[PDB]
Amino acid sequence: VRLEELSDQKNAPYQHMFRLCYRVLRHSQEDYRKNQEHIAKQFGMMQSQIGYDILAEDTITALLHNNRKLLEKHITKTEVETFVSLVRKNREPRFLDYLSDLCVSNHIAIPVTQELICKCVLDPKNSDILIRTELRPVEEEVWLTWTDKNNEHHEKSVRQLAQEARAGNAHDENVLSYYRYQLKLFARMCLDRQYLAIDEISQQLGVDLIFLCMADEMLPFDLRASFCHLMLHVHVDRDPQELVTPVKFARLWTEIPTAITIKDYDSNLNASRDDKKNKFANTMEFVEDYLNNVVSEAVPFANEEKNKLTFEVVSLAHNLIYFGFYSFSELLRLTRTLLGIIDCV
């Protein structure tokens, strides 16, 4: 029997047999470390059978769901290379999604697998499965260049890709989906301050480029949300940024002014904010404008696509606020907008 021919009516019973076998495997490893480890020794075969209608994807997901130690033990360079080869062969975003899931377990990054995936993906080889983004004077426009499965180059503008996808172009829609999944993979790799991947992804996708992509209202909301997530996890969370404590318990006697106002309180710490907000000033302005636009429309949460971008923007604002990028007056002005956003209708 052949995996590609399993779909035939002649091999139909074999499909049912294999599905039952995989269901047995899934049921035999539920909340049992010994069985999970025993089944994990056959990971290569399961990957070899990944892709076809055999529920191997579900079995792998169940096996690697919320098992940090098992993931670290049984995910290695061979597994990452197998996934890279599969994604090279199929060019489907599902394998990139699987790599992203491997990167993070239980919403917490796993440094060993993150580093392995970064080394295996960002290597000079395997560059044909990643879409390259560049800026062209054409002010400046964003262009994507990618190699198809036939080793043929293709170059096109993001605006044109979005226009064709909206028109109905399946090729451009699939390209956009692949790009979104690639951005998700990069964000997962850069999660929890993975400098090994940040140092190489920042030089490819810059702050200005990501801001332009987010501010381009003609692009898909999901794409804008992916770019916002990348900005949050590649640029905002880095070494210079550090969490701040809003309340201070230690005070110096002679530093206490006789009279204190909102302006004086803001100016007390307006040097570090002033000299660190230069990069993110445009981002903060965009966030404020987006929140005002959201609060100015009835039923803020009506479209899921826009809700994704709203969630990403709110997460970015939360990170910026907790990194001390906002003054007291700015926070007091933003609280009205937030309350209006989450107000009753």
Side-chain angles (χ1 to χ4, degrees), residues 1-138 140-345:
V1 60
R2 293 186 176 277
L3 295 162
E4 59 273 10
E5 299 183 3
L6 284 172
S7 301
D8 304 328
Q9 300 295 350
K10 180 177 64 57
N11 304 281
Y14 287 92
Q15 282 187 331
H16 192 47
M17 180 189 300
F18 302 142
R19 292 167 190 177
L20 292 165
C21 292
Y22 270 110
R23 295 299 304 189
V24 169
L25 289 175
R26 191 195 190 189
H27 284 286
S28 301
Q29 59 83 34
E30 181 171 345
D31 301 331
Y32 198 175
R33 181 186 58 78
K34 289 181 69 61
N35 287 27
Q36 288 168 4
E37 293 182 1
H38 190 257
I39 296 179
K41 308 192 192 307
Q42 307 302 334
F43 219 90
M45 186 197 73
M46 302 173 70
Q47 292 184 358
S48 301
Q49 296 182 4
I50 279 284
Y52 312 90
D53 192 331
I54 329 186
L55 285 57
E57 295 77 357
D58 186 6
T59 307
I60 293 283
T61 300
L63 184 63
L64 294 184
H65 183 256
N66 299 18
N67 293 89
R68 184 194 182 96
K69 308 211 181 306
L70 188 70
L71 198 300
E72 294 184 7
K73 180 63 65 57
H74 289 91
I75 280 57
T76 178
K77 182 177 179 59
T78 59
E79 308 299 349
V80 182
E81 285 290 357
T82 304
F83 276 109
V84 168
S85 300
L86 290 176
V87 63
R88 186 192 306 272
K89 179 167 62 60
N90 293 271
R91 213 64 58 100
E92 190 68 7
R94 204 189 307 176
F95 303 90
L96 297 178
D97 188 4
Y98 293 142
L99 289 172
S100 299
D101 299 359
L102 292 174
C103 298
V104 177
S105 179
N106 196 338
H107 307 297
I108 299 165
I110 309 307
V112 183
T113 57
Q114 224 174 16
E115 179 173 0
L116 284 170
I117 296 168
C118 298
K119 272 139 62 177
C120 192
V121 175
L122 305 180
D123 183 295
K125 76 199 184 70
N126 313 325
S127 61
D128 61 330
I129 59 172
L130 299 177
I131 304 176
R132 271 284 181 175
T133 308
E134 60 180 2
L135 299 175
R136 299 191 179 186
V138 65
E140 290 181 352
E141 192 177 8
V142 177
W143 280 59
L144 304 179
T145 72
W146 67 97
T147 57
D148 196 359
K149 61 179 68 176
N150 304 328
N151 300 271
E152 55 180 1
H153 294 51
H154 282 63
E155 308 181 356
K156 193 161 181 174
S157 60
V158 179
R159 294 176 173 273
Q160 287 292 355
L161 287 169
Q163 178 178 342
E164 286 294 352
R166 186 179 299 93
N169 192 5
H171 180 204
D172 292 11
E173 183 178 359
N174 185 17
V175 170
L176 291 174
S177 299
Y178 192 88
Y179 190 60
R180 291 198 312 271
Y181 278 70
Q182 175 175 334
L183 295 174
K184 182 187 178 182
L185 179 62
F186 291 177
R188 291 286 175 84
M189 286 196 304
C190 294
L191 181 63
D192 291 2
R193 300 195 182 192
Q194 186 64 228
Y195 291 99
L196 209 177
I198 293 168
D199 299 330
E200 186 172 359
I201 290 164
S202 59
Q203 298 189 342
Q204 183 184 346
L205 304 98
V207 180
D208 301 330
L209 188 155
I210 300 169
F211 167 81
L212 174 57
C213 296
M214 289 192 301
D216 192 333
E217 301 181 2
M218 311 188 70
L219 303 184
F221 287 110
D222 59 6
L223 189 68
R224 297 174 69 184
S226 301
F227 276 107
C228 186
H229 202 72
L230 192 71
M231 177 72 80
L232 197 172
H233 291 280
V234 177
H235 297 287
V236 177
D237 192 331
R238 295 189 63 176
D239 193 331
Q241 286 69 233
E242 184 176 0
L243 224 64
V244 303
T245 55
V247 179
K248 308 275 180 58
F249 288 99
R251 306 296 184 88
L252 209 155
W253 178 249
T254 178
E255 291 183 358
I256 298 169
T258 58
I260 189 69
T261 59
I262 299 292
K263 296 186 180 301
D264 298 329
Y265 189 87
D266 299 1
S267 300
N268 176 265
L269 304 176
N270 190 21
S272 180
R273 298 187 298 91
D274 177 70
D275 90 318
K276 78 187 185 179
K277 288 164 58 175
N278 301 330
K279 298 175 65 176
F280 303 150
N282 300 117
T283 304
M284 296 171 67
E285 288 182 352
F286 161 80
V287 168
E288 183 178 359
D289 298 1
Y290 185 89
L291 294 177
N292 295 330
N293 190 271
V294 169
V295 86
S296 65
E297 56 171 5
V299 189
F301 305 106
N303 180 19
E304 188 180 0
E305 303 297 348
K306 185 178 179 61
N307 290 11
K308 296 170 185 177
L309 181 60
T310 306
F311 168 80
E312 293 298 345
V313 170
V314 166
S315 306
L316 192 69
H318 173 282
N319 263 258
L320 293 172
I321 292 168
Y322 276 76
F323 289 143
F325 283 84
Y326 283 92
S327 63
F328 194 15
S329 302
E330 296 173 3
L331 294 173
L332 292 175
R333 185 166 60 266
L334 178 62
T335 195
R336 288 87 146 87
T337 303
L338 297 174
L339 293 179
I341 288 169
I342 62 176
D343 193 2
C344 294
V345 298

PDB file of all heavy atoms in Angstrom, residues 180 220-225 290 302-311:
ATOM      1  N   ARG A 180       2.250  34.929   6.774  1.00  0.00           N
ATOM      2  CA  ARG A 180       1.754  35.110   8.135  1.00  0.00           C
ATOM      3  C   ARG A 180       2.269  34.013   9.057  1.00  0.00           C
ATOM      4  O   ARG A 180       2.684  34.285  10.191  1.00  0.00           O
ATOM      5  CB  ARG A 180       0.226  35.134   8.146  1.00  0.00           C
ATOM      6  CG  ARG A 180      -0.391  36.361   7.503  1.00  0.00           C
ATOM      7  CD  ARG A 180      -1.835  36.537   7.940  1.00  0.00           C
ATOM      8  NE  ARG A 180      -2.599  35.299   7.837  1.00  0.00           N
ATOM      9  CZ  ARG A 180      -3.254  34.902   6.754  1.00  0.00           C
ATOM     10  NH1 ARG A 180      -3.256  35.619   5.643  1.00  0.00           N
ATOM     11  NH2 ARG A 180      -3.925  33.754   6.788  1.00  0.00           N
ATOM     12  N   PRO A 220      -4.430  43.158   4.995  1.00  0.00           N
ATOM     13  CA  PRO A 220      -5.342  42.366   5.826  1.00  0.00           C
ATOM     14  C   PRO A 220      -5.104  42.584   7.314  1.00  0.00           C
ATOM     15  O   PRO A 220      -3.974  42.788   7.769  1.00  0.00           O
ATOM     16  CB  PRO A 220      -5.030  40.923   5.416  1.00  0.00           C
ATOM     17  CG  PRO A 220      -4.463  41.033   4.050  1.00  0.00           C
ATOM     18  CD  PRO A 220      -3.686  42.313   4.045  1.00  0.00           C
ATOM     19  N   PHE A 221      -6.199  42.525   8.075  1.00  0.00           N
ATOM     20  CA  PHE A 221      -6.110  42.720   9.518  1.00  0.00           C
ATOM     21  C   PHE A 221      -5.258  41.640  10.171  1.00  0.00           C
ATOM     22  O   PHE A 221      -4.513  41.919  11.115  1.00  0.00           O
ATOM     23  CB  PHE A 221      -7.508  42.740  10.136  1.00  0.00           C
ATOM     24  CG  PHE A 221      -8.280  43.996   9.853  1.00  0.00           C
ATOM     25  CD1 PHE A 221      -9.373  43.977   9.004  1.00  0.00           C
ATOM     26  CD2 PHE A 221      -7.920  45.193  10.446  1.00  0.00           C
ATOM     27  CE1 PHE A 221     -10.087  45.131   8.746  1.00  0.00           C
ATOM     28  CE2 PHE A 221      -8.629  46.350  10.191  1.00  0.00           C
ATOM     29  CZ  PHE A 221      -9.714  46.319   9.341  1.00  0.00           C
ATOM     30  N   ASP A 222      -5.364  40.397   9.697  1.00  0.00           N
ATOM     31  CA  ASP A 222      -4.545  39.330  10.264  1.00  0.00           C
ATOM     32  C   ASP A 222      -3.063  39.578  10.004  1.00  0.00           C
ATOM     33  O   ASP A 222      -2.222  39.343  10.880  1.00  0.00           O
ATOM     34  CB  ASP A 222      -4.978  37.976   9.699  1.00  0.00           C
ATOM     35  CG  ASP A 222      -4.864  37.906   8.190  1.00  0.00           C
ATOM     36  OD1 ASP A 222      -4.342  38.862   7.585  1.00  0.00           O
ATOM     37  OD2 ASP A 222      -5.301  36.891   7.607  1.00  0.00           O
ATOM     38  N   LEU A 223      -2.724  40.053   8.804  1.00  0.00           N
ATOM     39  CA  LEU A 223      -1.334  40.386   8.507  1.00  0.00           C
ATOM     40  C   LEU A 223      -0.841  41.520   9.398  1.00  0.00           C
ATOM     41  O   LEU A 223       0.286  41.477   9.911  1.00  0.00           O
ATOM     42  CB  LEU A 223      -1.196  40.761   7.032  1.00  0.00           C
ATOM     43  CG  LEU A 223       0.226  40.941   6.502  1.00  0.00           C
ATOM     44  CD1 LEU A 223       0.964  39.613   6.484  1.00  0.00           C
ATOM     45  CD2 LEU A 223       0.199  41.560   5.117  1.00  0.00           C
ATOM     46  N   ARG A 224      -1.672  42.547   9.593  1.00  0.00           N
ATOM     47  CA  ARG A 224      -1.288  43.640  10.480  1.00  0.00           C
ATOM     48  C   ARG A 224      -1.093  43.143  11.907  1.00  0.00           C
ATOM     49  O   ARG A 224      -0.171  43.580  12.606  1.00  0.00           O
ATOM     50  CB  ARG A 224      -2.342  44.746  10.433  1.00  0.00           C
ATOM     51  CG  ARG A 224      -2.498  45.391   9.066  1.00  0.00           C
ATOM     52  CD  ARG A 224      -3.654  46.376   9.040  1.00  0.00           C
ATOM     53  NE  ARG A 224      -3.384  47.565   9.839  1.00  0.00           N
ATOM     54  CZ  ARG A 224      -4.254  48.546  10.038  1.00  0.00           C
ATOM     55  NH1 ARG A 224      -5.470  48.508   9.519  1.00  0.00           N
ATOM     56  NH2 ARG A 224      -3.894  49.591  10.777  1.00  0.00           N
ATOM     57  N   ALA A 225      -1.956  42.232  12.358  1.00  0.00           N
ATOM     58  CA  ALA A 225      -1.813  41.661  13.692  1.00  0.00           C
ATOM     59  C   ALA A 225      -0.516  40.872  13.816  1.00  0.00           C
ATOM     60  O   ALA A 225       0.164  40.937  14.847  1.00  0.00           O
ATOM     61  CB  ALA A 225      -3.014  40.771  14.006  1.00  0.00           C
ATOM     62  N   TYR A 290      -5.404  54.203  16.768  1.00  0.00           N
ATOM     63  CA  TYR A 290      -6.192  52.993  16.571  1.00  0.00           C
ATOM     64  C   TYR A 290      -7.201  52.806  17.694  1.00  0.00           C
ATOM     65  O   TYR A 290      -8.357  52.445  17.446  1.00  0.00           O
ATOM     66  CB  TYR A 290      -5.264  51.782  16.477  1.00  0.00           C
ATOM     67  CG  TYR A 290      -5.967  50.488  16.145  1.00  0.00           C
ATOM     68  CD1 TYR A 290      -6.153  50.096  14.828  1.00  0.00           C
ATOM     69  CD2 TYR A 290      -6.441  49.655  17.148  1.00  0.00           C
ATOM     70  CE1 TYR A 290      -6.793  48.914  14.519  1.00  0.00           C
ATOM     71  CE2 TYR A 290      -7.082  48.471  16.849  1.00  0.00           C
ATOM     72  CZ  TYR A 290      -7.255  48.105  15.533  1.00  0.00           C
ATOM     73  OH  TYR A 290      -7.894  46.926  15.232  1.00  0.00           O
ATOM     74  N   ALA A 302     -16.936  43.457  16.810  1.00  0.00           N
ATOM     75  CA  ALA A 302     -17.883  42.940  15.829  1.00  0.00           C
ATOM     76  C   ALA A 302     -17.235  42.059  14.775  1.00  0.00           C
ATOM     77  O   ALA A 302     -17.825  41.054  14.373  1.00  0.00           O
ATOM     78  CB  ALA A 302     -18.606  44.099  15.135  1.00  0.00           C
ATOM     79  N   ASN A 303     -16.036  42.408  14.317  1.00  0.00           N
ATOM     80  CA  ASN A 303     -15.313  41.644  13.308  1.00  0.00           C
ATOM     81  C   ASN A 303     -14.125  40.960  13.970  1.00  0.00           C
ATOM     82  O   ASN A 303     -13.319  41.618  14.635  1.00  0.00           O
ATOM     83  CB  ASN A 303     -14.849  42.552  12.168  1.00  0.00           C
ATOM     84  CG  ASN A 303     -14.084  41.801  11.098  1.00  0.00           C
ATOM     85  OD1 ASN A 303     -14.169  40.576  11.001  1.00  0.00           O
ATOM     86  ND2 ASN A 303     -13.331  42.533  10.286  1.00  0.00           N
ATOM     87  N   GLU A 304     -14.020  39.642  13.785  1.00  0.00           N
ATOM     88  CA  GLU A 304     -12.930  38.890  14.401  1.00  0.00           C
ATOM     89  C   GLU A 304     -11.578  39.312  13.838  1.00  0.00           C
ATOM     90  O   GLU A 304     -10.579  39.366  14.569  1.00  0.00           O
ATOM     91  CB  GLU A 304     -13.154  37.392  14.196  1.00  0.00           C
ATOM     92  CG  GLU A 304     -12.178  36.507  14.951  1.00  0.00           C
ATOM     93  CD  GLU A 304     -12.437  35.030  14.725  1.00  0.00           C
ATOM     94  OE1 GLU A 304     -13.385  34.699  13.982  1.00  0.00           O
ATOM     95  OE2 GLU A 304     -11.693  34.201  15.289  1.00  0.00           O
ATOM     96  N   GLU A 305     -11.522  39.598  12.536  1.00  0.00           N
ATOM     97  CA  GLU A 305     -10.261  40.012  11.930  1.00  0.00           C
ATOM     98  C   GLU A 305      -9.748  41.299  12.563  1.00  0.00           C
ATOM     99  O   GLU A 305      -8.554  41.421  12.860  1.00  0.00           O
ATOM    100  CB  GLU A 305     -10.440  40.187  10.422  1.00  0.00           C
ATOM    101  CG  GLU A 305     -10.942  38.944   9.703  1.00  0.00           C
ATOM    102  CD  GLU A 305      -9.975  37.779   9.799  1.00  0.00           C
ATOM    103  OE1 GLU A 305      -8.821  37.993  10.225  1.00  0.00           O
ATOM    104  OE2 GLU A 305     -10.370  36.648   9.446  1.00  0.00           O
ATOM    105  N   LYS A 306     -10.637  42.270  12.781  1.00  0.00           N
ATOM    106  CA  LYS A 306     -10.234  43.500  13.453  1.00  0.00           C
ATOM    107  C   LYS A 306      -9.976  43.265  14.935  1.00  0.00           C
ATOM    108  O   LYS A 306      -9.150  43.961  15.537  1.00  0.00           O
ATOM    109  CB  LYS A 306     -11.304  44.575  13.263  1.00  0.00           C
ATOM    110  CG  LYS A 306     -10.921  45.938  13.815  1.00  0.00           C
ATOM    111  CD  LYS A 306     -12.005  46.967  13.551  1.00  0.00           C
ATOM    112  CE  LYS A 306     -11.637  48.324  14.126  1.00  0.00           C
ATOM    113  NZ  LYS A 306     -10.388  48.868  13.528  1.00  0.00           N
ATOM    114  N   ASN A 307     -10.671  42.298  15.538  1.00  0.00           N
ATOM    115  CA  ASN A 307     -10.451  41.994  16.947  1.00  0.00           C
ATOM    116  C   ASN A 307      -9.047  41.455  17.179  1.00  0.00           C
ATOM    117  O   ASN A 307      -8.430  41.734  18.212  1.00  0.00           O
ATOM    118  CB  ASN A 307     -11.497  40.992  17.434  1.00  0.00           C
ATOM    119  CG  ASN A 307     -12.883  41.594  17.524  1.00  0.00           C
ATOM    120  OD1 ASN A 307     -13.124  42.702  17.046  1.00  0.00           O
ATOM    121  ND2 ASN A 307     -13.805  40.863  18.138  1.00  0.00           N
ATOM    122  N   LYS A 308      -8.534  40.664  16.237  1.00  0.00           N
ATOM    123  CA  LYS A 308      -7.161  40.176  16.354  1.00  0.00           C
ATOM    124  C   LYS A 308      -6.176  41.339  16.428  1.00  0.00           C
ATOM    125  O   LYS A 308      -5.301  41.383  17.306  1.00  0.00           O
ATOM    126  CB  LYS A 308      -6.827  39.269  15.169  1.00  0.00           C
ATOM    127  CG  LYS A 308      -7.657  38.000  15.094  1.00  0.00           C
ATOM    128  CD  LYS A 308      -7.433  37.274  13.776  1.00  0.00           C
ATOM    129  CE  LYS A 308      -8.341  36.064  13.642  1.00  0.00           C
ATOM    130  NZ  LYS A 308      -8.184  35.389  12.324  1.00  0.00           N
ATOM    131  N   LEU A 309      -6.310  42.299  15.510  1.00  0.00           N
ATOM    132  CA  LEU A 309      -5.424  43.456  15.509  1.00  0.00           C
ATOM    133  C   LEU A 309      -5.611  44.290  16.769  1.00  0.00           C
ATOM    134  O   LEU A 309      -4.641  44.823  17.319  1.00  0.00           O
ATOM    135  CB  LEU A 309      -5.674  44.302  14.261  1.00  0.00           C
ATOM    136  CG  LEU A 309      -4.802  45.548  14.098  1.00  0.00           C
ATOM    137  CD1 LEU A 309      -3.332  45.175  14.037  1.00  0.00           C
ATOM    138  CD2 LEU A 309      -5.210  46.317  12.855  1.00  0.00           C
ATOM    139  N   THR A 310      -6.854  44.426  17.234  1.00  0.00           N
ATOM    140  CA  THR A 310      -7.101  45.171  18.463  1.00  0.00           C
ATOM    141  C   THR A 310      -6.406  44.511  19.646  1.00  0.00           C
ATOM    142  O   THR A 310      -5.811  45.194  20.486  1.00  0.00           O
ATOM    143  CB  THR A 310      -8.605  45.277  18.720  1.00  0.00           C
ATOM    144  OG1 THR A 310      -9.254  45.827  17.567  1.00  0.00           O
ATOM    145  CG2 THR A 310      -8.882  46.165  19.923  1.00  0.00           C
ATOM    146  N   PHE A 311      -6.474  43.182  19.729  1.00  0.00           N
ATOM    147  CA  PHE A 311      -5.798  42.468  20.805  1.00  0.00           C
ATOM    148  C   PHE A 311      -4.290  42.662  20.731  1.00  0.00           C
ATOM    149  O   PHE A 311      -3.633  42.881  21.756  1.00  0.00           O
ATOM    150  CB  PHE A 311      -6.151  40.982  20.745  1.00  0.00           C
ATOM    151  CG  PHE A 311      -5.287  40.118  21.616  1.00  0.00           C
ATOM    152  CD1 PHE A 311      -5.525  40.021  22.975  1.00  0.00           C
ATOM    153  CD2 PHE A 311      -4.238  39.397  21.072  1.00  0.00           C
ATOM    154  CE1 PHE A 311      -4.731  39.226  23.776  1.00  0.00           C
ATOM    155  CE2 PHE A 311      -3.441  38.601  21.868  1.00  0.00           C
ATOM    156  CZ  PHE A 311      -3.688  38.515  23.222  1.00  0.00           C
TER     157      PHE A 311
END
